[PDB]
Ligand binder design. Structure first.
Ligand SMILES: CCCCCCCCCCCCCCCCCC(=O)OC[C@H](CO[C@@H]1O[C@H](CO[C@H]2O[C@H](CO)[C@H](O)[C@H](O)[C@H]2O)[C@H](O)[C@H](O)[C@H]1O)OC(=O)CCCCCCCCCCCCCCCCC
Ligand code: CLA
Ligand code: CLA
Ligand code: CLA
Ligand SMILES: CCCCCCCCCCCCCCCCCC(=O)OC[C@H](CO[C@@H]1O[C@H](CO)[C@H](O)[C@H](O)[C@H]1O)OC(=O)CCCCCCCCCCCCCCCCC
Ligand SMILES: CCCCCCCCCCCCCCCCCC(=O)OC[C@H](CO[C@@H]1O[C@H](CO)[C@H](O)[C@H](O)[C@H]1O)OC(=O)CCCCCCCCCCCCCCCCC
Ligand SMILES: CCCCCCCCCCCCCCCC(=O)OC[C@H](CO[C@@H]1O[C@H](CS(=O)(=O)O)[C@@H](O)[C@H](O)[C@H]1O)OC(=O)CCCCCCCCCCCCCCC
Ligand SMILES: CCCCCCCCCCCCCCCC(=O)OC[C@H](COP(=O)(O)OC[C@@H](O)CO)OC(=O)CCCCCCCCCCCCCCC
Ligand SMILES: CC1=C(/C=C/C(C)=C/C=C/C(C)=C/C=C/C=C(C)/C=C/C=C(C)/C=C/C2=C(C)CCCC2(C)C)C(C)(C)CCC1
Ligand SMILES: CC1=C(/C=C/C(C)=C/C=C/C(C)=C\C=C/C=C(C)/C=C/C=C(C)/C=C/C2=C(C)CCCC2(C)C)C(C)(C)CCC1
Ligand SMILES: CC1=C(/C=C/C(C)=C\C=C\C(C)=C\C=C\C=C(C)\C=C\C=C(C)\C=C\C2=C(C)CCCC2(C)C)C(C)(C)CCC1
Ligand SMILES: CCCCCCCCCCCCO[C@H]1O[C@H](CO)[C@@H](O[C@H]2O[C@H](CO)[C@@H](O)[C@H](O)[C@H]2O)[C@H](O)[C@H]1O
Ligand code: OEX
Ligand SMILES: [Cl-]
Lengths: 60, 448, 342, 108, 30, 81, 336
């Protein structure tokens, strides 16, 4: 061949993960954002002035 | 019924009066179910009555019979229709079943109880009941799993399924080893929708189709049992509007995706939509044209391998941007096409020049010749051919009808998501009837 | 005792179901004939002798293909009167000669004058400002420039748009092939006016319906209104803040909003009418000479503009023989421009 | 203001239709009323300014006012005598019309 | 030259949009 | 709001007299239009060519009017059976 | 009260005190639309010629390559690419990526996500401001049209080269070829679309003129009538009854909307429904369900074909069909 390319186009890879580094990128970023979300769930709900019980939720 | 005086909904929004009337709402959904079953039976009998063996299925404007053919009813080797009685009994069975379905819909709507809660606690529900809602979701999720298992039971134990890729020619084949490996199943779900990948539209053998419906049947049954024995968690209760119109919008969004997926399935897929019954796909006809002329020009004497077109690219054969040998011309875009007629002439490197030069069978030439003259091109008044055609042939491909109709339905049901979801949040928050003049929210907000 | 003008004025401007007015003495007679001319022509009159075409339901046309076709090109700009020197009182021959087209165009153009006068007469009686009439000036400019001014600059009425659905489509396709009307900056302003007006119509309608005040308890919000109420029916403050944060800019003056809804469409149609006046004299923005000179000097320079010029060559050559039968073009196949294969 | 009794809506047989055409709704007037979707009414009726202005758009400008209808239209003056003559003429003209269509056609 | 005049006209038009949004006359109630 | 002193259309279209009168007038107008085409009168009044007289033994192609001031004579020749 | 980073971040994102409302759709809209905008500006000014037909014949579309504003365009992706996903990292070099039409796919993909997020952002602000929804429903009509010409039509036709070029002259080429291959003018959905814009343009002028004609006198003649309206006025700035009295007499009384709420729904429904259908028209014609074909429909007694205005339209279609993409077809049928 003449030059080098990823050669992943049109190959049906899961999520386009040609190399494992892409897997780490998606997993690490998601875990971080979920991590900061996880520690804030109680505060976010407290504003509702209601407990997140079985009756909690915008309902009509 | 009711009126606008006691409801506030006008006649053009009349079915909105059934939101909190469980019994009458049940009748409405059972009645529309009778309508769906009625159409399936009525069109099945209509298509059978208007079916002639002198022409293939896709030339006669049939869209239901090809579905029955793919299930391996009344078809023989090569896609020939050998019997029409299985199509008849299917049509009658739906037509009669719609009558009992209509009676229940008519009964549960007019005569039956208006609300099911007091008299039938098992069926009674209130939309805000997250638990009861998941049980109904869980139950109807199991019946979907059982429906998926019926497909694999038929393909493995009851006659089999039509396999257009079957060795020795396409025929009804009993699937014995469905592809159940997780890597294959997850491979279809998480591949890109772009060319070459095609998401789930690219499923190319009936082992994967049946293996896939085994996963769906198992997931739905487990998901049905899970959603029956549990109730939504805290993160789910704070992420969704728990009202009747909100649940409707959730399905409208989901059904919108399915409509678009069906539109692409009928347009591209040649495995679950065999070309022997639905006609050639857009790509198939384009590939068929270059194949037809290559065969004719070789017979008239020409090295199709080294024939150069006006642009300098190969006239009959060229290389795809990844190196595979593909048909030349404007069909280069459809190099991903894979059909039961062209695959035998395709080695690991692409099209085989030796096979294309000495080992092209007449049935392959006949298949490609037929497909190029039944390309999906057609007009609204059913005049086959490009827009610059004359009124000679009355033909529009069933794929064209299925792709266009179920895209229009898919898009309108997306607007259904937008409409019925925006209103569900507004109705629940409490400002779906307008801004309150006493406390307008913007007035409290500081100036911008 | 009251004078004739006063007695007639009383009856003409009576408040009845269908207002007549003085302008009705011009509108209704002419408007009825123009309506009647189109229906009669599209149902029984043929275009066999003026165009070599069938354009009546009687011949076998749909609503899409039936039309009142223009006269032949040999007639030039003849007014084609029933008593005119071309057809002298012979009604059936007058219809075959295409005289029904000038009938509709002439009686129809005066009905437009009669309708704009109807708007002025009713506005004055009701004692309101006359901006609807000023607005209707834009449709009149389009009709005058296209159906009257444009053929008057060409060989004859033959090149005017024939009153039909498919006939207008031919007229539209003719302008692309022969005038490059898409490239004309005046159709461009007209397109922006029409697409801009359609945008304004949808946004204003949606914004009002989604900033309504809660003036009732029913979900049917249409009923919570009264035409004589003093309060506004929707929140302009809420509407202004929504579009200020979504789009960055929003209307704060309701009067300016509605004048704009009137200015965009009218200005757009008027600009188009200026462009068609240019096309009457073939003063068309057909080509960019700098790109054509460049393309002639290197066979590598390609732009979408040069690709359209090649498309116009195909339209002109393949359409002229039948579209212009008077030219008696006998183009053999080899001389028509066509690309490889297809 | 607007007097709903003088809008020509007083002879509608069905009271629900009469209330709909008047733009009024006793049920929605109650503050304990509940919308079919579960929303509780705020106390207004169909229109909150009905008392200030007399009515809604429906009351203000109805398009179905049977009171203004002429009483002569309630009955056919010629009675059964004109009615049987109508039935006789319909049959006669129907037969003549069918004969004309067949006679003037390229049938057969 | 033309390419320079086309770019200035385009970025000039974009510059007006920026000012019309952020340096706008604020709408004030009464 | 308010009426211009004319009978409401709903009153007229619900009255028996209207249907007794229009049960004959409307059908007659329909048959009148039918007989206009059926009898061939339309072809002779508007000069539309019957489907068997577009082309004549002499002229096998489309007609073409060329003389403006002799168009009446020329169209009669082109329309001649 | 908000102390957690995410709680404070989510309060800032959903804040209605920002000059421009960011939302959760805004965290999708802003990055995608800025990506598409920046690539569009760079490619429109200085991008190399793109081989669109896959026949190795580059087409120039940038200002620095001898285009003006009218002819300049972003050329669609190469016909060799087809529907294949062609990001930057799938190319050996940026020069190869520019040659094969990479920017078009990048712009279209991020733009499609942007307008979908822009539609969601419109709903979100309404929910935060306590308004009714369905401004986004009205905006779905132009969104559907954009996806039809940029996404769905390439999908049906099988190549992004058949998407609409991002240019003024490029747009016209897209329309002309569309008529030749699908006869869009004779499609009933472009007809409903034209009624949508002609009707919308009519109703915009009628509504604007009627309201302007009924302004209540609140100024003098040395100032604009617009001065009569003060932002935040409780009362109406024009007499609805006066405008209804005029329009109900211009035609007849019951052809006019005395209901202002009904009038504005009609003002919204008519263009939105019209543009919905014309968007479906392009989407349907993506799967080769073309417009009405009445060619050689009228035939005489002896079998000769009597042409109509449809046949004249066909001759124009033949001209465009044989001349579009001259060096791209090797076989007579334009199946692709
Ligand atoms: C206002 C409302 C707007 C609505 C817009 C709606 C559009 C409808 C489409 C998609 C959106 C709906 C949701 C998904 C539906 C399923 C789409 C799909 O099944 O997708 C695939 C289908 C069909 O794909 C085709 O699948 C085919 C499979 O056939 C193969 O296999 C077949 C079976 O054997 C045959 O053998 C055949 O011969 C063989 O070639 C081929 O592989 C084709 O090359 C391949 O294109 O449609 C496609 O191609 C789609 C191409 C990609 C989408 C278009 C670009 C959009 C880009 C967005 C931003 C970029 C990326 C993010 C996107 C998504 C992120 C998750
Ligand atoms: C799939 C279509 C469908 C279905 C299943 C329903 C179902 C229903 N609607 Mg509805 N509706 C629809 C479409 C539909 N609608 C449409 C398109 C509109 C707009 C015009 C409306 C507008 C509307 C309004 C305004 C109202 C309803 C109401 C109702 C409910 C009760 C009707 C009633 O009791 O009055 C009685 C109706 C009749 C007695 C008519 C008798 C005709 C029968 C039922 C049809 C049977 C024909 C069939 C051939 C017989 C089959 C028999 C079988 C054994 C073979 C009911 C559950 C009412 C409601 O909300 O309840 C509170 C009500 O107010 N609808
Ligand atoms: C039409 C079928 C259906 C419907 C309407 C619902 C609806 C619901 N489910 Mg359920 N579920 C289903 C099927 C269904 N489920 C099936 C078949 C299973 C078995 C796998 C489950 C297992 C399940 C679990 C374990 C949970 C729910 C939960 C919920 C609730 C939260 C909704 C949510 O946040 O999801 C939104 C989805 C996400 C936030 C993540 C997106 C991931 C999707 C699937 C994209 C990934 C695509 C890819 C192909 C999936 C790979 C899966 C693999 C097995 C093939 C909700 C009411 C939650 C709950 O409330 O508990 C009671 C909960 O934790 N479901
Ligand atoms: C508002 C009424 C109105 C108006 C403005 C027009 C206008 C027009 N008609 Mg039309 N027409 C009308 C009603 C009207 N018509 C009616 C009711 C019929 C019968 C159904 C017709 C039938 C008709 C036909 C058949 C034709 C026209 C044609 C024309 C056009 C040119 C021919 C022409 O006007 O003759 C000449 C111009 C004039 C006569 C204007 C001069 C007016 C002066 C002031 C009269 C002075 C009178 C004089 C002192 C003598 C007094 C005599 C007596 C009172 C003692 C023209 C634009 C022709 C056409 O369509 O062109 C293709 C055509 O052939 N009309
Ligand atoms: C027959 C009966 C069983 C016989 C033998 C069982 C033998 C071994 C069982 C081993 C598994 C035990 C797992 C630990 C319990 C657990 O994980 O949660 C078991 C969970 C607990 O679930 C919680 O239970 C609570 C107490 O009842 C409440 O009901 C909560 O609302 C509910 O969420 O039970 C389930 O909800 C079932 C979830 C899975 C449903 C099927 C999914 C696949 C199909
Ligand atoms: C402001 C303007 C308002 C008025 C506008 C004009 C109004 C009416 C115009 C019509 C009146 C006639 C004007 C011309 C008077 C004149 O000098 O005569 C002009 C000619 C005179 O007569 C002709 O003269 C020629 C030249 O010398 C030759 O001699 C011809 O042989 C001779 O016939 O006759 C006419 O054209 C009058 C025709 C009248 C037709 C009335 C309308 C018919 C409508 C429907 C018919 C349907 C079906 C019939 C067929 C079957
Ligand atoms: C986008 C980048 C630049 C692109 C430039 C392209 C040219 C066309 C667009 C600019 C010309 C039109 C703007 C008209 C301004 C107007 O009417 O409002 C007047 C504004 C409003 O602010 C005033 O501010 C006042 C506050 S105070 O009084 O100053 O404190 C306050 O009352 C209110 O806001 C207002 O009155 O007054 C100003 O303070 C603006 C400064 C003067 C305008 C600058 C023009 C040149 C911009 C830069 C050009 C070089 C670009 C290259 C940069 C490296
Ligand atoms: C250039 C000027 C144009 C002149 C106008 C056209 C003249 C021909 C008019 C005759 C036909 C009109 C009569 C039908 C019209 C008619 O008779 O309506 C009648 C009806 C109300 O009329 P009523 O006869 O009931 O009036 C009695 C009132 O006092 C209340 O009962 O109107 C409606 O139903 C509501 C809106 C329907 C009409 C929709 C308007 C849109 C249609 C046009 C587009
Ligand atoms: C609720 C309601 C509604 C609806 C309803 C419905 C929707 C119903 C349905 C119903 C139905 C859904 C019905 C069905 C029926 C069916 C039937 C009854 C069948 C029968 C059959 C038969 C009779 C036979 C046949 C045959 C055979 C056997 C074979 C072949 C031949 C034949 C075809 C002959 C509405 C809207 C009105 C409104 C009101 C309310
Ligand atoms: C059968 C078969 C198959 C398949 C299978 C399967 C297994 C499927 C599945 C699938 C799945 C398994 C899934 C799908 C889809 C999903 C989705 C589509 C999701 C949705 C959700 C969402 C979208 C979300 C929502 C929410 C959340 C929670 C978050 C935030 C936001 C909200 C709230 C909204 C195959 C291909 C192999 C072959 C052929 C056939
Ligand atoms: C021109 C002429 C004349 C006149 C005539 C007239 C004046 C009138 C006629 C008139 C008329 C007035 C006719 C009409 C006809 C009508 C028709 C033919 C109708 C049609 C319609 C239809 C077909 C319908 C459709 C529809 C729509 C629109 C909507 C939906 C539904 C439907 C589809 C049904 C005279 C003698 C002066 C002399 C000169 C010549
Ligand atoms: C297509 C079908 C449209 C025809 C429907 O025509 C109909 O619509 C009007 C509303 O716009 C109806 O108007 C009715 O609608 C209201 C809505 O519940 C009812 O409460 C009232 O009885 C009445 O005002 C007329 O009784 C009739 O003219
Ligand atoms: O690329 Mn654009 O235009 Ca859709 O057809 Mn085939 O491909 Mn090409 O030709 Mn015709
Ligand atoms: Cl080709």
């Amino acid at each position: 061949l003449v030059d080098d390319r990823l050669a992943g186009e049109g190959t049906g890879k899961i999520l386009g993960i040609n190399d494992p580094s892409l897997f780490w990128a998606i997993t690490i970023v998601f875990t971080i954002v979920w991590g900061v979300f996880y520690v804030s769930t109680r505060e976010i709900d407290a504003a509702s002035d209601r407990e997140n019980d079985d009756d909690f939720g915008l309902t009509l | 019924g009711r009126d606008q005086e006691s409801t506030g909904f006008a006649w053009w929004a009349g079915n909105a009066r059934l939101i909190n009337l469980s019994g009458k709402l049940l009748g409405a959904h059972v009645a529309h179910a009778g309508l769906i079953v009625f159409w399936a039976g009525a069109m099945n009998l209509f298509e059978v009555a208007h079916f002639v063996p002198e022409k293939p299925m896709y030339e006669q404007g049939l869209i239901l019979l090809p579905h029955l053919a793919t299930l391996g009813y009344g078809v023989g080797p090569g896609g020939e229709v050998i019997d029409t009685y299985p199509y008849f009994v299917s049509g009658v069975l739906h037509l009669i079943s719609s009558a009992v379905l209509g009676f229940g819909g008519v009964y549960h709507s007019l005569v039956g109880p208006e609300t099911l809660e007091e008299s039938f606690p098992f069926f009674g529900y209130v939309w805000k009941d997250k638990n009861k809602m998941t049980t109904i979701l869980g139950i109807h999720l199991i019946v979907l799993g059982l429906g998926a298992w019926l497909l694999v039971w038929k393909a493995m134990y009851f006659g089999g399924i039509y396999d257009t890729w079957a060795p020795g020619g396409g025929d009804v084949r009993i699937i014995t080893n469905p592809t159940v490996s997780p890597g294959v199943i997850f491979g279809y779900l998480f591949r890109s929708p772009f060319g070459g990948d095609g998401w789930i539209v690219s499923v190319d053998n009936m082992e994967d189709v049946i293996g896939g419906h085994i996963w769906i049947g198992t997931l739905c049954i487990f998901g049905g049992i899970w959603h029956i024995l549990t109730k939504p968690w805290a993160w789910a209760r704070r992420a969704f509007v728990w009202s009747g119109e909100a649940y409707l919008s959730y399905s409208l969004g989901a059904i919108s995706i399915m409509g678009f997926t069906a539109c692409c399935m009928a347009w591209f897929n040649t495995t679950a939509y065999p070309s022997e019954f639905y006609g050639p796909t857009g790509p198939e006809a384009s590939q068929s044209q270059t194949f037809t002329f290559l065969v004719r020009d070789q017979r008239l004497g020409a090295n199709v391998a080294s024939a150069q077109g006006p642009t300098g690219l190969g006239k009959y054969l060229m290389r795809s941007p990844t190196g595979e040998i593909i048909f030349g011309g404007e069909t280069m875009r459809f190099w991903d096409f894979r059909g039961p007629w062209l695959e035998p002439l395709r080695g690991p490197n692409g099209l085989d020049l030796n096979k294309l030069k000495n080992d092209i069978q007449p049935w392959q030439e006949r298949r490609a010749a037929e497909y190029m003259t039944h390309a999906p091109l057609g007009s609204l008044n059913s005049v086959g051919g490009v827009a610059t055609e004359i009124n000679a042939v009355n033909y529009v491909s069933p794929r064209s009808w299925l792709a266009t109709s179920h895209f229009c339905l898919g898009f309108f049901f997306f607007v259904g998501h937008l409409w019925h979801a925006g209103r569900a949040r507004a109705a629940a928050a409490g400002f779906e009837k307008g801004i309150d003049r006493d406390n307008e929210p913007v007035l409290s907000m500081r100036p911008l | 005792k009251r004078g004739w003008f006063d007695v007639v004025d009383d009856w003409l401007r009576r408040d009845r179901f269908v207002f007549v007015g003085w302008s009705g003495l011009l509108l209704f007679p002419t408007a009825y004939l123009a309506l009647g001319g189109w229906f009669t022509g599209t149902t029984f009159v043929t275009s066999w002798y003026t165009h070599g075409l069938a354009s009546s339901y009687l011949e076998g046309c749909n609503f899409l293909t039936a039309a009142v076709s223009t006269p032949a090109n040999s007639m030039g700009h003849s007014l084609l009167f029933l008593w005119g020197p071309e057809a002298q009182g012979d009604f059936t021959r007058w219809c075959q000669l295409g005289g029904l087209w000038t009938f509709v165009a002439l009686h129809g153009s005066f009905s437009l004058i009669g309708f704009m006068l109807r708007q002025f007469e009713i506005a004055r009686s009701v004692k309101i400002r006359p901006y609807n009439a000023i607005a209707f000036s834009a449709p009149i400019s389009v009709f005058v420039s296209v159906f009257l001014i444009y053929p008057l600059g060409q060989s004859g009425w033959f090149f005017a748009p024939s009153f039909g659905v498919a006939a207008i489509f031919r007229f539209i396709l003719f302008f692309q092939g022969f005038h490059n009307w898409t490239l004309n900056p005046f159709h461009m302003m007209g397109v922006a006016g029409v697409l801009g007006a359609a945008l304004l119509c949808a946004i204003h309608g949606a914004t009002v319906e989604n900033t309504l005040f809660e003036d009732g308890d029913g979900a049917n919000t249409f009923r919570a209104f009264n035409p004589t109420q003093a309060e506004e029916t929707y929140s302009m403050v809420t509407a202004n803040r929504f579009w200020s944060q979504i789009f960055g800019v929003a209307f704060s003056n309701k009067r300016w909003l509605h004048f704009f809804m009137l200015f965009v469409p009218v200005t757009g149609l008027w600009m188009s009418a200026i462009g068609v006046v240019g096309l009457a004299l073939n003063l068309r923005a057909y080509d960019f000479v700098s790109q054509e000179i460049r393309a002639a000097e290197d066979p590598e320079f390609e732009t979408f503009y040069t690709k359209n010029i090649l498309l116009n060559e195909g339209i002109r050559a393949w359409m002229a023989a039948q579209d212009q039968p008077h030219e008696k073009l006998v183009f053999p196949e080899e001389v028509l421009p066509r690309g490889n294969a297809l | 203001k607007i007097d709903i009794s003088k809008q020509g809506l007083n002879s509608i047989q069905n009271e629900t239709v009469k209330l709909n055409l008047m733009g009024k709704s006793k049920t929605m007037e109650s503050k304990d009323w509940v919308d079919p979707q579960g929303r509780k009414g705020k106390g207004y009726g169909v229109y909150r300014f009905a008392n200030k202005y007399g009515a809604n758009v429906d009351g203000y400008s109805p398009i179905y006012t049977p009171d203004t209808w002429s009483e002569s239209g309630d009955s056919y003056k010629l009675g059964t005598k004109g009615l049987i003559a109508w039935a006789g003429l319909i049959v006669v003209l129907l037969g003549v019309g069918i004969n004309l269509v067949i006679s003037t056609s390229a049938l057969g | 030259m033309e390419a320079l005049v086309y770019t200035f006209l385009l970025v000039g038009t974009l510059g007006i949009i920026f000012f019309a949004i952020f340096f706008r006359e604020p709408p004030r109630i009464v | 709001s308010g009426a211009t002193g004319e009978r409401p259309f709903s009153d007229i279209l619900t009255s028996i007299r209207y249907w007794v009168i229009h049960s004959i007038t409307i059908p007659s107008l329909f048959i009148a239009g039918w007989l206009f085409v059926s009898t061939g009168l339309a072809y002779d009044v508007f000069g539309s060519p019957r489907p068997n007289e577009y082309f004549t033994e002499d002229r096998q192609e489309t007609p073409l009017i060329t003389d403006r001031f002799n168009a009446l004579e020329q169209v009669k020749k082109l329309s001649e059976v | 009260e908000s102390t957690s980073l995410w709680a404070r971040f989510c309060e800032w994102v959903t804040s209605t005190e920002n000059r421009l409302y960011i939302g959760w759709f805004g965290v999708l809209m802003i990055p995608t639309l800025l990506t598409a905008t920046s690539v569009f500006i760079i490619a429109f000014i200085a991008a190399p010629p793109v081989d669109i037909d896959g026949i190795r014949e580059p087409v120039s579309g940038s200002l620095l390559y001898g285009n003006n504003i009218i002819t300049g365009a972003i050329i669609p992706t190469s016909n060799a690419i087809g529907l294949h996903f062609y990001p930057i990292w799938e190319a050996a070099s940026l020069d190869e990526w520019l040659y094969n039409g990479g920017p078009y796919q990048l712009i279209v993909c991020h733009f499609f996500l942007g307008v979908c997020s822009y539609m969601g952002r419109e709903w979100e602000l309404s929910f935060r401001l306590g308004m009714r929804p369905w401004i986004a429903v009205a905006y779905s009509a132009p969104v559907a049209a954009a996806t039809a010409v940029f996404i769905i039509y390439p999908l049906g036709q099988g190549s992004f080269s058949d998407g609409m070029p991002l240019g003024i002259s490029g747009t016209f080429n897209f329309m002309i070829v569309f008529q030749a291959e699908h006869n869009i003018l004779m499609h009933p959905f472009h007809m409903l679309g034209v009624a949508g814009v002609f009707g919308g343009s009519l109703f915009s002028a009628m509504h604007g003129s009627l309201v302007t004609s009924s302004l209540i006198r609140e100024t003098t003649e040395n100032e604009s009538a617009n001065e009569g309206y003060k932002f935040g006025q409780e009362e109406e700035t024009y007499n609805i009854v006066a405008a209804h009295g005029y329009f109900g007499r211009l035609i007849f009384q019951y052809a006019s909307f005395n209901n202002s709420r009904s009038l504005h729904f009609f003002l919204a429904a008519w263009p939105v429904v019209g543009i919905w259908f014309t968007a479906l028209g392009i989407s349907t014609m993506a799967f080769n369900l073309n417009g009405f074909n009445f060619n050689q429909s009228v035939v005489d007694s002896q079998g000769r074909v009597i042409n109509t205005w449809a046949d004249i339209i066909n001759r124009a279609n033949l001209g465009m069909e044989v001349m579009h993409e001259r060096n791209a077809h090797n076989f007579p049928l334009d199946l692709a």
